[PDB]
Design a protein around this ligand. Structure first.
Ligand SMILES: [Mg+2]
Ligand SMILES: [Mg+2]
Ligand SMILES: [Mg+2]
Ligand SMILES: [Mg+2]
Length: 755
């Protein structure tokens, strides 16, 4: 480029910066092409072009001005890249601001989508505010290859589409530009099928939607509604390995955590809306907005000491009682709680408070509602036409055709969309088995095998691998969490090793073992010591997340207190012992709302949590217990640096079944960070109980779940114990401990103690 051209850019004299900025073809070679990427990055000292799908990174050079950058790259196609931008000591990674020089679909957009590889397809499908022919308006586009006609109906045309008939491009996608309308336009697509039947559809790629049960889509100028402040969070995430950090998740269903009064408006980030009543049977209650949740949930979670909030599915869904798991508006956060910018504000405020956001994401199926994706264009478009692979008959839902390029693209670009536009830090996928198996919940003779004769759903496995490959390439330090309940191998292993590419898997076996164990009267736990210890036998085959989820406190299973045997004191004590054990056992942590304060009743999605219980001491004490346990977890490296290495754990003794005692070490990089954990799972106290330890010295009683401030009896070791040079459990030293009833101790050597 010349200095004249650069200076026109620097000084805002250039007539159209897209002519020069962004990605431009310089020449074509025999088997490759030479491209230049240019950027004007005021205040940046350095920049790079990352090509994350090729695992490449190329420096940019300043050209004529220290803040104007160019990068020349030879490659056949330069479709997917990011800019890394360094401004002083800080780096950010963004998409190129000059990536897309028109609002309309290009030939290249259509080709990539036809192949299933358009990772940013949501920039062009849906509804986007833009300019065509010099006039500002909205560009609409929708994939409906077998429709006979499609028209845009909406508020702007009184729902009559005759003068807003779309144009079909390349026999596949319909488009229309509508001048002088903008954000907040309410619309649907009116489709005529090959039989001549006329019907109405919400926008698959819509960014916002009316409030259930209304279904119209709403135009959002998605890149001009919110200003983020989370660049330092994002940089730390990108440059960190979350597997080596504390990860303690508070699982939340946004609709049912806390309700407000339906007698007043729902406040939003600078504005308000009509209240969204929770149900016709509880009409004085409304949902809180994403704004109000930012103001109330976030400081609540920060004070409790969790590292992450995991949301049950926030994508648009028509029925409260699905909990979010039956989604019809994949590209929009539900309007139950306000607007897209209110959810952005929520995530930005989490990041400000040092809390990450994990979304339950639902790629496995979709319901049959007429406004949604079903039978979209008069054919089985999103779902597979064969019900043996295209329906989950026991659920009444439809299964995506994962092998179909445009369907795969809808879902792969969807997962990326939430990281891009909403800055989320992870995803969790429920019921991954539902996708993996061609015989899932199907009777003999009502499914067919794969091309090799097996039950593996090959197209779904390919899709899951593609999602995880891409997600970690574009967003390296995220969490991708699976619940898979059939012992599929290598769920949380890299795709190149034959894994499915998740980085964490819920330890469902652990969860069953623990809850079944604690439900047993304590005298009888001696016949079930194997529930305590078995999950370590297969533990190192996956990277496990220890999750006690919403699914365990519904349908007659009771909430946590109710699962426990004994009198009220003992029920509380059992809860504290279980969760102390959970937080000391190797693996990351997840627990659901209401578990932290001892709600007696099961979770009810139609009401809110029983907050009045926190007026009473026993619930306050349990909540203080969790507050302190989360604080300890973040403070003790041996509870989180080596979760997934042999070094990080070793049983001391797990043979005393008759007294339901087990003990173990946790380790980290510094030997002085090793912890001694001792568990007593009966109400029998032990005044003298010997436990082998590796070193001489004073072992501080760092945590004691029977402490009085947690509701316990206050039994224990009054600060700590000096080890004896008395070999025990195959260790050269030992502690003679007092073990409180239905409790866990964590001890830690203080090598600086005065003898
Ligand atoms: Mg009409
Ligand atoms: Mg399940
Ligand atoms: Mg058993
Ligand atoms: Mg209530």
């Amino acid at each position: 480029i010349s200095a004249d051209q650069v200076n026109q850019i620097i000084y805002n004299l250039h007539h159209d910066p897209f002519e020069i900025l962004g990605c431009h073809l310089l020449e074509e070679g025999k088997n490759t092409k030479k491209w230049v990427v240019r950027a004007y990055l005021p205040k940046a000292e350095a920049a790079w072009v990352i090509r994350p799908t090729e695992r490449k990174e190329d420096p940019m050079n300043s050209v004529h001005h220290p803040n104007f950058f160019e990068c020349i790259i030879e490659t056949p196609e330069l479709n997917h890249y990011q800019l890394k931008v360094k401004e002083g000591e800080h780096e950010k990674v963004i998409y190129d601001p000059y990536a897309f020089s028109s609002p309309y679909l290009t030939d290249e957009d259509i080709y990539l989508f036809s192949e299933g590889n358009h990772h940013r397809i949501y920039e062009k499908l849906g509804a986007h505010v833009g300019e065509i022919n010099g006039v500002k308006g909205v560009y609409f586009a929708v994939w409906a290859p077998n429709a006979r006609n499609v028209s845009v109906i909406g508020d702007f045309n009184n729902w009559d589409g005759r003068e807003h008939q779309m144009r079909k491009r390349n026999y596949t996608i319909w488009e229309l530009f509508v001048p002088e309308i903008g954000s907040g336009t309410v619309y649907k697509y009116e489709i005529k099928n090959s039989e001549g039947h006329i019907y109405e559809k919400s926008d698959p790629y819509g960014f916002y939607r009316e409030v259930r049960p209304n279904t119209a889509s709403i135009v959002v100028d998605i890149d001009n509604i919110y200003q983020w402040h989370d660049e330092e969070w994002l940089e730390k995430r990108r440059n960190s390995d979350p597997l080596k950090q504390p990860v303690s998740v508070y699982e939340v269903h946004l609709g049912s955590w806390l309700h407000g009064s339906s007698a007043e408006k729902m406040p939003l980030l600078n504005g308000e809306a009509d209240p969204v009543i929770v149900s016709e049977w509880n009409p004085g209650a409304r949902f809180l907005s994403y704004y109000e949740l930012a103001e109330k949930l976030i400081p609540y979670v920060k004070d409790m000491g969790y590292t992450h909030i995991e949301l049950l599915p926030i994508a648009e869904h028509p029925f409260d009682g699905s909990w979010g798991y039956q989604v019809t508006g994949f590209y929009s956060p539900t309007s139950r709680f306000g607007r897209p910018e209110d959810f952005m504000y929520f995530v930005d405020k989490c990041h400000e408070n040092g809390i990450g956001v994990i979304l339950d994401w639902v790629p496995g199926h979709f319901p049959k509602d007429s406004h949604g994706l079903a039978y979209f264009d008069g054919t089985h478009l999103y779902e597979h036409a064969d019900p043996r692979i295209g329906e989950h008959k026991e659920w009444g839902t439809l299964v995506f055709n994962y092998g179909r390029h445009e369907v795969r693209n809808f879902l792969v670009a969807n997962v990326l969309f939430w990281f891009d536009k909403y800055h989320v830090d992870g995803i969790r996928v429920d019921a991954v088995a539902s996708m993996l198996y061609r015989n899932y919940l199907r009777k003999e003779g009502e499914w067919i095998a794969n091309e090799y004769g097996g039950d593996e759903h090959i197209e779904a496995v390919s899709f899951i691998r593609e999602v995880n490959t891409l997600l970690f390439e574009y967003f390296p330090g995220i969490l991708s969490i699976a619940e898979e309940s059939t012992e599929w191998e290598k769920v949380s292993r890299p795709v190149y090793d034959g894994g499915l590419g998740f980085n964490l898997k819920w330890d469902m076996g652990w969860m069953h073992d623990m809850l079944d164990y604690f439900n047993i009267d304590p005298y009888f736990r001696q016949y079930h010591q194997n529930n305590v210890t078995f999950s370590m036998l297969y533990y190192y085959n996956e990277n496990f997340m220890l999750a006690l989820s919403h699914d365990e406190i519904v349908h007659g299973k009771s909430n946590m207190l109710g699962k426990m045997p004994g009198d009220e004191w003992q029920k509380y004590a059992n809860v504290r012992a279980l969760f102390t054990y959970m937080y000391t056992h190797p693996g990351k942590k997840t627990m659901f709302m209401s578990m932290e304060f001892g709600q007696w009743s099961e979770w009810n999605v139609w009401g809110d949590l029983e907050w009045h219980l926190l007026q009473y001491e026993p619930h306050q004490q349990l909540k203080q217990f969790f507050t302190d346990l989360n604080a300890l977890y973040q403070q003790e490296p041996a509870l989180y640096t080596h979760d997934f290495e042999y070094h990080g754990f070793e049983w001391i003794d797990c043979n005393d079944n008759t007294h339901s005692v087990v003990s173990f070490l946790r380790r980290s990089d510094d030997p002085n960070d090793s912890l001694v954990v001792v568990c007593n799972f009966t109400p029998q106290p032990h005044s003298h109980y010997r436990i082998g330890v590796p070193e001489a010295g004073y072992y501080v009683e760092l945590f004691n779940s029977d402490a009085k401030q947690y509701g316990g009896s206050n039994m224990g070791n009054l600060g700590g114990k000096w080890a004896d040079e008395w070999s025990f459990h195959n260790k050269p030293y030992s502690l003679d401990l007092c073990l409180p009833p239905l409790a866990v101790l964590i001890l830690k050597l203080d090598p600086t103690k005065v003898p």
